Structure 1
Amino acid sequence: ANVDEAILKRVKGWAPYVDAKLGFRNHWYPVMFSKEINEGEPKTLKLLGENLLVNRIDGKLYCLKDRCLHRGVQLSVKVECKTKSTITCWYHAWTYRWEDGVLCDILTNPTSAQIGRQKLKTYPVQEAKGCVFIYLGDGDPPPLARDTPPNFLDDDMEILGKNQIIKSNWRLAVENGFDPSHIYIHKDSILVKDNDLALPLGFAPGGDRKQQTRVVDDDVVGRKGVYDLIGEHGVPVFEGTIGGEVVREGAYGEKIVANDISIWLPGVLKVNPFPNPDMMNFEWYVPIDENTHYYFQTLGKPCANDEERKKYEQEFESKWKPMALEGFNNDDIWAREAMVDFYADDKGWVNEILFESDEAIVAWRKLASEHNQGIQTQAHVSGLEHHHH
């Protein structure tokens, strides 16, 4: 639907994934932090190509599509919330309820037959761990846990992080994140020295194909993902050689980290333990449009009370955020961007020459193709098209 049929026909093992250029519909996605949206102050954002508006009323979040039903203008061009529970389009005053999107009034013509007979698209919104999740889908939403990695929602798990827009398709961000051998680009990260980490340069695989990963599709919660087990039978590379001569060495620090990595639909990575032996790293690559994504980074650390929460918060600002989220992950950002040209014409999905560790990426592509809840299409963006027969 989104890609030349000749290409989809070639990638028989994961065509749905290759076709999912706009992301997967019917999944929850984090788009901002709770503290970024204030009471009565609608905020705009684009998710899966759709312009949305989020507002907080009586502390609860509501989401309406930011596109008037009438002439298709963004209501946000000139926000007019004239009553607590509604928003009035600045153009011809069509008024909608945040609660159900129903066109309840039209100031330019209170006798219009459209009143009460049209409805603006709304999307479920849920806040968890100080993060704002939007269910970009149709029908009643599944539990949030289904689209989050294990432990993210733990009661004692304190979540902190940052978010930003990155210029690359979401899939390139995902594959880079789950890529076992990309650890090489982190060899000079400040976190390595400054946090005394043990970090190999790569991995010499061991065992059979099936042993390289653990595909999860029997999670009682419904979670669908893959675990990277390359380290279970492999031999970590600490001395890189060329022509038999050592030209590079891994990091021989004491802190053991990132020995438990997994990727979960709709596209969230869990690195454990990281950036420190007593922490976890959860990062989402949320589709904005075919060329961009939100790089939603979160770090979690169990905290029994305000005491620890405050301390954690302090270290997050002074150390973890600058040394890890940025000092470590920044290289991930330009790495993703570096793959844009090769895959931009969709040809990269055919011409890529993979090697052993990409077995982890293949497992993900297959899992995503088989368990996604829907392929977002441009028609979903402009307006579904069909001619029942």
Structure 2
Amino acid sequence: MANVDEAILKRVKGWAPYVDAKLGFRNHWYPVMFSKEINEGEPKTLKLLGENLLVNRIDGKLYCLKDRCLHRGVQLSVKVECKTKSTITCWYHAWTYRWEDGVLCDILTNPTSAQIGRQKLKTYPVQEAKGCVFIYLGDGDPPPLARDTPPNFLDDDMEILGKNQIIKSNWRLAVENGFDPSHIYIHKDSILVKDNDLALPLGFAPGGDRKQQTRVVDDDVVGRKGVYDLIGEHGVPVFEGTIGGEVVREGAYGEKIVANDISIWLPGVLKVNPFPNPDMMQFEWYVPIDENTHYYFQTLGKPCANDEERKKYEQEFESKWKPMALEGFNNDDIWAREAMVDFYADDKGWVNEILFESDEAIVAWRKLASEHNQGIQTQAHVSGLEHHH
């Protein structure tokens, strides 16, 4: 919805909405923190899709209010005043809102005001799943969470563990950094490769049949929308890198077979299967904070039937998986994303980029995202919708 120069949008006819979605897609669920990070009665702040939000846990349930008073637009979080269990009072003129529905229920500075009961602060649905806090940054009653999650993430036996941080790049550069079969060249020296004895080529190149390697999913019963890049089953693993015909670098000839298939799903979550070990899966979100930043929400899933396994998995995670994979492997993806910022900062990169074969899957994602997103977030959504209808 008009976030980019019109001259540029007219040029990218195949995926203009995607290029315009600089602030992310509205009306989708997004993970922003882990359940253990938000305690009972201790509001936490965060910015999602450019909007400042407040999250609080009351009687164990999470509630989300926009962190901007309706009166003079100050953030309530500058000085939090929760005077009753179910409400929050602005520190300025004491306009008081209910966490459950955002209604302005009282105003301490003028209990007779005509505004009481007649105004409502924006609220957003919040749901906890797999120890992760998801916020529906949208309007109207929310769709089921599964619609915006990759396959198997919500499986009963699937134990989820991970980490989250803020990275300085637009969310799309992160998505395309993750859903890229040839970028793993940057991970050729990661400690996970040797230390976990992985079989990892320098890159996965397009196999014989292109129509078989890329699988667009828009028929999932759950409503999921995404694209598969079947690199393992239809791609070609390049293990020997040559220059002028001379081998200058080789891939990893380990025993553990990983990354059989990768898939990217709206609103922007990647699934790598299996990874970082043959018996695990990696699910990572690239959540838009503002046009220049995103949350890099990493999670690793491993089936567990009992606490003894869960505890064992949790122990391995802290001692190996987190330090060796999430960090040891993905840390290079961080500066890689930061390195693409300049080229796309003026939006011109969306026109001047020179793609090659392995980027076919990314193009498929751009079209899927353009066609199936549930809304283009705009700066007007951030400040206040504007219209003369």
Secondary structure of 1:63's aligned partner:
strand
Deviation string 1:5-29 (CA, Å, 9 cap, x unpaired) is 0000000000000000000000000
Q: Say what the alpha-carbon RMSD is for the aligned residues.
A: 0.8
- What do residues 257-315 of structure 1 show as CA deviations (whole Å, max 9, x unaligned)? 01111000000000011000000100000000000000000001111011001000000
Displacement, 1:184? 0.5
CA distance 1:110–1:204, change in 2 (3 Å): closer
Give 1:235 deviation, angstroms. Answer: 2.5
Give distance in 2, aligned partners of 1:116 and 1:337.
47
Counterpart CA distance in 1 for 2:60 and 2:205 is 52
CA contact (8 A) 2:229 2:262 kept: yes
TM-score by length of 2: 0.99
The answer to whether the 8 A contact 2:192-2:324 is kept is yes
Q: Distance in 1 between matches of 2:236 and 2:293?
A: 36
CA distance in 2, matches of 1:273, 1:79: 44
Per-residue Cα deviation, 1:12-52 (whole angstroms, up to 9, x for no partner): 00000000000000000000000000000000000000000
TM-score (norm 1): 0.99
What is the aligned partner in structure 2 of residue 150 from structure 1? 151
For residue 305 of structure 2, give the secondary structure of its aligned residue in structure 1.
coil
Q: CA deviation at 1:57?
A: 0.3
Which range moves more in the overlay, 156-165 or 202-211?
202-211
Query: Does residue 309 of structure 1 match 2:281?
Result: no
Question: Percent sequence identity over matched residues?
Answer: 100
**1:211 deviation in Å?**
2.3
Per-residue deviation, 1:178: 0.3
Correspondences of 1:38-187 after superposition (within 5 Å): 38-187=39-188
> Gapped runs of 5+ residues in structure 2?
none
Note the C-alpha offset of 1:203. Answer: 2.9
Give, in whole Å, the separation in 2 of the partners of 1:16 and 1:211: 26
Displacement after TM superposition at 1:105 (Å):
0.2
Classify 1:298/1:234 alpha carbon distance in 2 versus 1 (closer, same or farther; 3 Å). Answer: closer
Conserved 8 A contact 2:231-2:261 = no
Which aligned runs of 4 or more in structure 1 are off by greater than 4 angstroms?
none
Structure 1 segment 150-229 matched on structure 2, within 5 A: 150-229=151-230
Shift of 1:208: 3.9
Question: Within 1, Cα distance between the matches of 2:234 and 2:32?
Answer: 38
| CA displacement, residues 170-199 of structure 1 (integer Å, 9 cap, x when unaligned) | 000000100010011110000000000000
Tell me if the contact between 2:209 and 2:234 (Cα under 8 Å) persists in the aligned partners: no
Q: Contact (CA 8 Å) 1:68, 1:75: kept in 2 or not?
A: yes
Q: Deviations over 1:108-164 (max 9, x none)?
A: 000000000000000000000000000000000000000000000010110000000
Identify the range of structure 1 (355-364 vs 226-235) with the bigger mean alpha-carbon deviation: 226-235
Q: Does 2:342 correspond to 1:341?
A: yes
The equivalences for 1:311-326 within 5 A come to 311-326=312-327
Taking the aligned partners of 1:62 and 1:203, their CA distance within structure 2 comes to: 44
Deviation at 1:202, TM superposition (A): 1.5
| Partner SS state of residue 240, structure 1 | strand
Note if contact 1:205-1:231 (Cα within 8 Å) is conserved in structure 2: no
Q: How much has 1:388 moved relative to structure 2?
A: 3.8
Q: CA deviation at 1:230?
A: 3.5
What is the CA distance between 1:365 and its match in structure 2?
0.3
Q: How far apart are the structure 2 equivalents of 1:338 and 1:13?
A: 25
Who is 2:367 aligned against?
A: 366
The answer to whether the 8 A contact 1:28-1:136 is kept is yes
SS of residue matched to 1:163: strand
Distance (whole Å) between structure 1 residues aligned to residue 363 and residue 116 of structure 2 = 51
Match of 1:330 in 2: 331
Alpha-carbon distance, 1:232 to partner: 3.0
Provide the rounded CA distance (Å) in 1 between the counterparts of 2:282 and 2:209. Answer: 28
State the partner residue of 2:17.
16
Shift of 1:229: 1.8
Question: Which segment is superposed worse, 208-217 or 30-39?
Answer: 208-217
Mapped contact 2:185–2:203 kept (Cα < 8 A) = yes
Shift, 1:205, TM fit: 1.9
* Kept after mapping to 2: 8 A contact 1:230/1:357: no
Structure 1 residues 70-79 or 207-216, which shifts more? 207-216
Q: 1-side partners of 2:161 and 2:306: how far apart?
A: 15
Aligned equivalents of 1:295 and 1:235: distance in 2?
29
Determine the C-alpha separation between the residues in 1 that align with 2:209 and 2:375.
32
User: Does the 8 A contact of 2:233 with 2:260 survive in 1?
Assistant: no
Secondary structure in structure 2 of the residue aligned to 1:316: helix
Structure 1 unmatched runs, 5+: none
1:233 deviates by 3.3
Asked whether the equivalents of residues 232 and 261 of structure 2 are also in contact (C-alpha less than 8 Å), the reply is no
